[PDB]
Every structure is written in structure tokens, then in C-alpha cells.
Symmetry: D2
């Protein structure tokens, strides 16, 4: 169990950007710019800096060329310059390695702290950032599939309660979770900015990065991404969806970048900013918890996720989950799911919903 | 092979209504009225008469209580009273059983002919119908999932080219179809009213009724149907979707009524009313043909369909398809499909797309 | 009254394209391509040929450079090649001037008949046209404001009953109209393809072209056109809307091109294909007939419209409407309208709504 | 000028509910429940307690039968019970009249402080509230016009800078405003929850309540409200819109309840939670600032607004604005507005846009 420091936690505002290492920068650019329509803040031979339609900070996504595709940093913006100092002190007390750069790790970020957190994830905390033209009313640029915000990250980690307690001490509040009747936690969602999530924990081998999520204004915008991917004959890069979530109540889609980094497109979750916001716990065997319409969760969604780097740029070693596997208990050979609690009708034994089994 | 009569074909306007036999009228009422929001034109202990939001004829759907759930009639409106006489002459020349009732078979229909057609299907042809209040501007009644029109029927039959040729002689024009490189036809779509389909043929054991389709105004209306069925904890009655079709380009959903009759909800196909409307043929192994986003077709979609009745109310005997099965050649153990023709990446062998095999 | 020819009417499928004369081709191209997103089928230094997202015929709009902005032709597709011969015999019997070009008037159209019709409008009838790539599943090209079909034309003419009867003889069926209790007709809508309209008649001084209409898939696509025009700081070229129509029940917007040609964007009217489709008549004083939400109709919408050309390319002389004016009877100084019939609450007198 | 207290400001989370006095409780019920689809948390013969589709606190709107239609309270939720003590100390030092009830003023609210604030408005601050079934996934109940959240209030007040400085001290941050080139401020928007606004100030005679605003998920939900009101033949209770705002960038509609209280329906503004969120200032003569599409703003939108009560239940006296009037300088007889700055084409002298 990760102890609560004496030092005060940094005041985190929100998730702000991710730095992803990619193997072919031009292929990646084609995906995030030509397919997804993200706005280029800066680019050169080594990096692409991208932002969403409504962003005023320099970027929400940095693509960095490197030999091994991986998450290099998931970056949170903090409330003041002094909060970056607080972050350094807090993580030092946790016994974590930290690196401080007064002039930033990436362009358009100033004083920044990166840490190898207790779950092995590379986090950044910063305040200073270059403001850019906020494109929120540039409807001359607006795409039929326009990505308007960065919304959240999702992390794969083998011990969800351990992580959850650490994120609670850092000031994140859990909005929803998935548990069973035998004491196992499979997933949790937690926030700072008053939406369902800024980060989320998914039970599995880790540290790995599950996805980064961007939002759209309306559901039809998500449908358009799917439609465009069909027209580009890259529908094989739609992993799962589109759907309605149980957890979060958002309409959603998961797609895969050229290095298999998973991106979620999301819209219309709900307000969580009250401190006693009712926490919602779903049972892992409820077949409406992940897709509210009951559609089956594709097995790659549970098994595949991105490598993460340490501060030297080396891939973090994976620690195997020993708690029960959500895949196995729901759609594997001994799995079970229900539509209506206690009703045998609409239940699934040892296979997925809608007449499918695991490939 | 079905000969083309010397007698003139009736001028068919559109699909107009279906009569389905249902086993429990109150449970069927709940589904069609309380879940789906269709509007009651007439009802009693034996039947419920339903119409869509923009309809002016008496009804689009008649639920008739009986012992065996089945299609009893699929009805087309013809242009003039004289076309009913033409339908009668045409089918008598084909050597089909016909029955004529000057005062209709169901309420709100007047002079009508029912026929056991050459494919075993119970067709009705009529002109006269009782006009009712057209609810098209009754936004005080409009539901978030409102069904606005009847769009089409889909019929299962063993020999698609044989049925197609017969429908062409009747004046239906083929818009899209699905074939393979060795000359098998798996499905065909054909219209009179200048949309993609008024009826459609799906290759399989027949005669059976695949579905009846209603349209909505917008894609979010279809999303709401899914969302409501989740809230009612009947997501197990969502069979397939929602999706974008390849064939037709419509946004779609398939759901199952209490007797397992399949209902499609559909919106935003394209104009086909020009006589040289370009036909579109798809390869059966193209994994974007049915769902444009490459999502897998649930196997029940290929295997299950409603019984149909003859003019005495007995179930029509089923005849086995001997051409190749669409299920088997795409998603069965020996099936295959592709995202990009010729590309092994994004292809599926011996299972469905997205990492599933047959349950 | 325009007599019915004994010659059979051509079988008209739908409205197909308009040829608009424009004064500055580059400015016009910026509006129809860069702002509105129509797809180029052909261009050169004299003309731009444009189509909507789901079209397979060569074009829905031809922009032709010329000295005076005007409608040059409103073209209907007919069902077979022989229907062009029918159209020629029909308009000849009507006493109208006609011109037949076996290889077409504009690129991508074959054998074509143009006429000065009895209302003074330049109509074209054709069958043959060059097919192009139908872009209906080209979602890589799809705009947030995408125009998906050509829907209809709207003509300004002084005597609506006279024009309506002429159109009915040609096979158009009236779907909706606007009348008063005194028996005046102010407008009528009529169709061939099974929607509310392929053309429509607006009472006023004519012949003038009121607008050309394109459809979108959804309401949000119309919203996006407005939002884009705001970002381009040309919100002054939004004339009226967005709104819900009473007549037609369609969601709508009216905008002005650089020569003040009016374009409607339109979605979600209803099916009219049955021969006994119920006809709806609105009262001219009903403030929900034009905009269902009761928003006022700007006077420019009633008074302004495009010149039309004769077959020589000269402007057609205009005839003044002598029947009552819809403008005057609803929003002029002696006009009125209501929200609920016979209720002075929500009524407007000598004054527009709201 | 309103001084800044030595006492620390309460930590305000968001606008939470409004209490509106209405004259005919049945007619109001019909509007808010039958037309608009709000959900009943509690009702009796004197009061209806309503909530939006995604709310879990007891209510977002209280309709209270009374003899004079008016705003009785605009309530903000604070982060902790001790924040209600802070609000009490803060307003006392301001020399504002306060009243504190441990068991609340309305049903479903616990310990609560009401104040007559320095602008004459009745604010409530509370933490304690009765939790109710969150209906956010009750799509069996979801209306085609569904109102999903309470978004904001908008207040009419004569001196916008005076008001702004006071709200800033209280911890609200200004996101957008409307000024001219002569030093006048006509309007300002400001927030706690990270949206464009929790409350907003409109320059005018006041204190008056301009409107209360509810959100929808999508733009088509607002369009459905208009379509329904047409079917119900009450399109005359549509005041302004639907439209796209300049300020806020939100899609919007303004409608009027049976006592003429103005309700806005609103969707899809942007995130403002960062402390250095760029402030946007519009010029008052910019014809895209209120409606981005340049549709004219009807003069009733500028002149009409609801009475507000003091803590005894009496109507607050109205103080006249002496700063220039937004109405007069844009759409009055000597008004002006532009489409493109510096372009005569698309400008309007002495009248509203669009004819
Ligand atoms: O403004 S109207 O409701 O009369 C109307 C209805 C349909 C149209 O296409 C139109 O331009 C005008
Ligand atoms: Ca268990
Ligand atoms: Cl999920
Ligand atoms: Cl399909
Ligand atoms: Cl405004
Ligand atoms: Fe997520
Ligand atoms: Fe279908
Ligand atoms: Fe029109
Ligand atoms: Fe507002």
C-alpha cells in the first residue's frame, strides 16, 4: 500500500497532453492530421505537436519519433508555478525518481517535472505553456469529425485498489468503478476537472497505456469518424464501437494508430464536480456496464495496450496481474454475464454476447 | 424460371404495411407502442393497427393475435383501383392462388387482392385505404426515437436470381446486390418509390420474412432506441448494430420483437428514381459491404427469420438453399473476408472481424 | 389560362440542375466551392460545373460568366430520350419559343430542349447526361455542412392559379399552398419525384427566380453553414433562418451568393408519392405557415429575386402582380398575423412578429 | 466600489438551483413539466421541486406560489459545510443582511445561508442536500427536448464593473465581456465550475433576473423545443433564437414562462477551468457578438427581466443604469452595428440587422 505523504499534493487542474513515441512520423501524421483532423501547432523532422479545436495551450498531443513506440509522458497541468515544486516534493517523499527541466521537456511547455510514479507510469506536471490561437469558433476549419478537447487517459495496472488509493491521496476522486461480489476491483475512473475522468485504471499487466481520449461535440461527429475510416478503407483500424458506455454514460469509439496506440473518441458524459458526487459501482458480470447496448467487448480491448517508458527512455518492465481477469470472468471459457440480474434469459455462459465467442 | 406474363403488371407505388401474427397481443403492444412509440389507428382484443409519424393511410403495421407467429401479409399500395384488377390477372396468368375481397382483409383497407406468390410469399395489393390524421407536425407527440415512415421489407428465398427476375417483371428495379467472383448471388435490393429498397431478397432457406424496416429522421433517433432498450434492460433484444450499411449507405439497427420478428430501424439512404440509376455490386468477401465500419454480422442475422403463412393461415413449407451460404463463406470456420481487396492485413480467415469467432 | 396541349406531356423525373449567370467567376467559385463545398465536375475560365454529394449525373449547378447576373436555365430531367421530342412538340403547341441542341447547351448534357415557357421562364428538358463518380460514400470528402442533393426551384410569378394549372397539365401535383378566405392564392408547391416540391410558385412580380434549394442529411449540417458564415464574417449574407417551415415541415436556411442569387438549404420534408397525397392549405395570416416557430419573414425575402433570361440571353421583362401581396397583408402597415386563430394574444397588426 | 473582505471567501462549486415565485402553480407546472419535461422531485399545493435529467441533488428549480412573480433565491453549492460559515462571515463583513437556517429554506436543502448581496440579489449558499435518483441513464424517460443540467443565471445590474470586481473577489473568473471604445462595459460572464458561466451580469436597470439557463445534450434537442412549442401553438412564447452565441459559443434559445420569467436553453460552450483562461472581449457594435449569425436581438430581450425579492419577501427597488444602453447604441434610432469591422457593407445605422 502506497503511503500518504506529509507534503501537500500538487493542485492538478486536468489532463493536458500526452507525448507518444512513434516509429514512422509521416505515417503517424497522416493518421492524426489527415484522418482525425487535429491542428498542427508545430512540427519538424522529429516531432509533431497537435491540438484540439477548443484548446488554447500549445498542444494536447506530441508525437516523437523513436525506435520503440510507447507512452513517453502523460502530462497534467497544475494550478500554479508553485504546484510544480509541490509535485517534486510529494513524489520525492513517495521515493520516486524525478526529473526537473526549467525550460520544459517538449516545445511550448516551460518549467516541468517528470516522474516515474509508484505504478511505473511517466507523469509530467507543469504550469507554464505557450498560448496559441484558440480555434473554438473557427468553423471555417471545423471538420465533420472534429476533435474538440482532450478528455482523459486510461492506464493498465495490475492492482487497481493500490493505484486508486494513491490517486485519491493526490486528490483525484473516483466517479465509477467495476467490482465483483468477491472483493475484486477490475477498473476505476477518477477525476480532477469535474468530468467522469482525467485518468482511469484498468486492471491488467502493467504499466501500459490503454488509451488517450478526445471528445467531440455530438454523437454524429463520432459516426463520421467511422464513416471516414470506411471511405479510406481503414475500417480494420476501428477496434471497438461505436457504442454507449455504461460507465461514464458517454458515446464512444476506439481506434488504433499506426503503432497500435489506442485512441478513444468520446462525448456527453456527466458533471462530477461536487465533492460528494455519488460513486457508481457496476458488477463485472453486468453485460451493460461497458457497452450499455450489450455489444460484446472485443478481446484485444482487454489484452492489448501501449508500452510506457521510464525517464531514461527505456521500456518499463511489465508486472503480471494476479487478481481475476475481466476478460476471463465475463467472456472466457468459465465466464458469465447477465442482462437482467437473476434472470437466466439474456445470460451468457462461457462466451460473449450476441452469438460470438473469443477468436 | 418464372415467365413474364402477357398481362400488364400492376403499377406498384410502395410498400405500405405488413400483417404479422403475434402470440401475445399485450406483450406485442408493449413493444411496438410503449418501447417503439408507434401510433395506434385502431385496436381491440384481436388486433392492433399501427402507423408511423408521417403516414396518412390507415396503418403501416397490423398485429393479429394467433397461434403461430408469422408473416400473414406483406402489402403494396398500387396507383389506381384498376391496378388491383391488373394484379389479379397477372398472378392468375402466373398460375398463383389468389383471393380478392372487395371490402378488404384488414380494417382501413378496401378492395384488396392477396396472392401466394411464386416464391411462396403472401403479397397483398390494394389502392383504397382510410385516410387518418397525418401526425408529421405533431411535435407534442414526437419521441426521441420516433419512427417516421415505413421503408421496406426483406424476404429470405433460396434462389436470389430467380426471385430477382420475377420482381423485375413486376417493375421493381435492382439498386444494389452482393455476389462472388464465381457467379453466386447472395442478396439483392430493389425499389419502386425511388429509395434503395421497397423489398429485398436475402439468400437462404425460404420463404421466410427477414425483417420489416422503419425509418427515422436522424441518426441520433436510432441511437436513442438503443439507449432506451438499455434503460428498459432489454439490450438482449438488440440483435445487430447500430451501424452504417455498405449496401444502401443507411444508418441502421436490428431489434427483435416478443415473437422474434426482426425490425430494422434505418435512415439516410439515397435517391434511386432515375431509370439509369447506377447499380452497385459488392463482393461477398468485402467486410465493409454489410457494415461499412467492418463490424461483424451476428450469425442469427443469417440463420433466423419469420415463418410466412399461405392464404389459409397455414405456415408455408420451407425449401433449402443449395447455393453457397453467406455466413459460411465469410465468418464460418472456412470463411474469409477482407478490408482491402488483395491485402492480407485487415483480412479475416475462419472467424469474424474484430477478434470474434462464431458462438 | 394556358391551354392543355393535345400533345402528350414529357415524363419529368425531377429537377436536375440550374445554370446561373454570375459576374465574377472567381468570387462565385469561392462561395459555391470554398464556402458551400460543392464538388467540381468541370471548370474552365468561363464556367464552373458543380454537383452535390449523392449526385451521379454530371452536375446540379452550372455557373456561367456573363455581363448580367440571372437565371439562364432551370433544367428538368425526363424519363427517356423520346421525352425530349415530347417536350418539343408540347411547347411548340403551346406557342412558346424553343431551341433544340442535339449535343446540349452545357457540358455533360446531351440532346436538350430549351424553351421560354408561358410564364416567361427558361426551362430545359434533357435525358442524356455524362455519369460521374457518385460521391455518396466518400466520407473522406464530406463537409460538416455537406450539400447532398439538389431539391427544388422556386419561381416568382404574378398569377399563381394560372401557373399552377399549367404545371398540373405537365404532371406536377400540388402538395401545399397558401390562400386567404377571400380566395387569393399566394403560393403553391408541387412535385414529380415524391417530395414536397420540385418547383414552387411564389406570388409576386415575375418571371424571377426566387431560389434554388439543396438538401443536407441532418439539421446540424445547416447549423454548420451558418456557423461557417459567421467565422468567414459574411453573416450579412444569411438572409433568413435557420428555421422550421410550416409549409413542407422542412428545416431551412436562406443565404445570398455574390450576385444575390438566393440559395435555400433544406432537410427533412415528407413523402408525397401517393396520388391521393393529402393537400395542405394554410391561411396567409397564420404566423406559423412560413416559419413554424413564428419568426418574422424579412421583407427582402418577398421583394428580392433573380432576373431570368430569354433564349437570346437577354433579361425577361417583368409583369407586376395585381393580386394581393403576402407582404402587405401580413407585415405591411394594414397587415396582420396570428399565432392562434381568433386570439388577439400573439397576434401582430401593422407589424411583423417578435 | 465594493471592498474586498479580510474574511476568506467561501469555496463555491457551481450554481445549483433557483427559487422562482409564480402566480398560478398549475399553469407553471404545465410549462415546466408538460412542455419542458423537467422531473418532479417533490410537489405539493404550494411548491414544485424540479430537477434536470443528470442531477443528483434534490432539485435545480423550485416554483413557489406567491402573489408577485419574482426571483426569491439564486443558490450556489459550496464545497464543504464549513464554507457556509465562511460565506456568512464574508457577507457580514460586507455589511450585507444575512439569514442562516440549519434545516434549510426549501425542502431537500440542509444548512443554508441567504443574503441580500451588494447588488441587491438574493443569493443562497449551502452544502447539505438530499440526494435523489440520478436519471442520467433513464432513457425510458428521455424527451426529444430533454433538459440535462442547470447551467447558469444571468443578472441585470446597472454598473457592470462594480459588480464584476465583487464577483471576482468572491472567486468568480471573467471569461468573456462586452465593452466599447469609450470605456463602457455592457456585460460580463464569469464562472466557478469551468464552463463559460455560472452567473453573468447584463447592464441594465436592476437588480432584476435576466434568465435561468438549462443545458441539452445536442443542438437538435433545442430545435425540438421550438418545434413542440409550434405544435402546441405557443410559438409566441419563443422570444429569441434558436441561434449560435458569439459570447460563449453556445447554441441557444430564449423562451418565456407563464409569469414571463425567461428561460434559456443552452448547449456546447467550452472549458474555462484553467486559471489563465484567455478572456475574450467583444465590441458592443459587433453584430456577431450575441448572435453569431447576425440575427437581430429583439428589444424585449434588453428591456424585460424578472423582479427579485429581498429576504423578507418584498420586491427590490430598481436602480436605473446611467451608463450607455446596449439597446440604444446598437439598434436604437442612433444605433450602429457592423458585420466586418471597418466595412460599410453589412453595417446597420439606426436599426437592427436583417431588414
Ligand atoms: O417559407 S415557407 O414555409 O412557405 C417555404 C416552404 C418550403 C420551401 O422550400 C420554401 O422555400 C418556403
Ligand atoms: Ca462472484
Ligand atoms: Cl468500456
Ligand atoms: Cl446488412
Ligand atoms: Cl446573447
Ligand atoms: Fe476511456
Ligand atoms: Fe433492410
Ligand atoms: Fe424552397
Ligand atoms: Fe445565458
Amino acid at each position: 500500500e502506497i503511503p500518504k505523504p506529509v507534503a501537500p499534493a500538487p493542485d492538478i487542474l486536468r489532463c493536458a497532453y500526452a507525448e507518444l513515441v512513434v516509429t514512422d512520423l509521416a505515417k503517424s501524421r497522416n493518421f492524426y492530421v489527415d484522418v482525425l483532423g487535429l491542428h498542427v501547432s508545430y512540427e519538424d523532422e522529429n516531432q509533431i505537436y497537435l491540438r484540439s479545436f477548443e484548446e488554447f495551450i500549445h498542444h494536447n498531443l506530441v508525437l516523437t519519433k523513436g525506435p520503440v513506440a510507447a507512452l513517453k509522458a502523460m502530462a497534467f497541468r497544475v494550478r500554479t508555478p508553485e504546484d510544480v515544486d509541490k509535485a517534486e516534493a510529494y513524489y520525492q517523499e513517495l521515493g520516486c525518481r524525478t526529473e526537473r527541466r526549467k525550460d520544459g521537456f517538449v516545445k511550448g511547455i516551460g518549467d516541468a517535472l517528470r516522474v516515474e510514479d509508484p505504478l511505473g507510469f511517466p507523469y509530467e506536471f507543469f504550469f507554464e505553456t505557450t498560448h496559441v490561437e484558440r480555434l473554438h469558433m473557427r468553423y471555417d476549419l471545423y471538420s465533420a469529425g472534429e476533435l474538440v478537447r482532450l478528455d482523459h487517459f486510461n492506464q493498465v495496472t495490475p492492482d487497481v485498489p493500490r493505484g486508486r488509493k494513491y490517486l485519491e491521496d493526490l486528490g483525484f476522486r473516483v466517479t465509477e468503478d467495476i467490482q465483483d461480489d468477491e472483493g475484486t476491483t477490475y477498473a476505476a475512473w477518477m477525476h480532477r476537472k469535474g468530468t467522469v475522468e482525467d485518468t482511469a485504471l484498468t486492471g491488467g499487466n502493467g504499466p501500459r497505456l490503454h488509451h488517450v481520449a478526445f471528445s467531440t461535440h455530438e454523437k454524429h461527429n463520432i459516426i463520421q469518424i467511422c464513416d471516414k475510416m470506411g471511405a479510406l478503407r481503414i475500417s480494420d483500424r476501428i477496434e471497438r464501437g461505436p457504442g454507449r458506455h455504461g460507465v461514464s454514460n458517454a458515446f464512444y469509439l476506439y481506434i488504433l494508430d499506426p503503432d497500435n496506440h489506442r485512441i478513444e473518441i468520446y462525448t456527453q458524459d456527466y458533471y462530477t464536480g461536487d465533492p460528494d458526487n455519488p460513486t457508481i459501482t457496476w458488477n463485472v458480470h453486468d453485460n451493460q456496464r461497458r457497452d450499455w447496448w450489450g455489444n460484446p467487448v472485443v478481446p484485444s480491448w482487454y489484452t492489448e495496450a501501449s508500452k510506457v517508458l521510464d525517464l531514461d527512455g527505456n521500456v518499463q518492465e511489465i508486472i503480471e496481474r494476479t487478481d481475476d481477469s475481466e476478460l476471463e470472468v465475463t467472456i472466457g471459457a468459465d465466464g458469465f454475464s447477465f442482462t437482467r440480474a437473476g434472470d437466466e434469459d439474456g445470460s451468457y455462459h462461457g462466451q460473449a454476447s450476441k452469438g460470438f465467442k473469443l477468436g
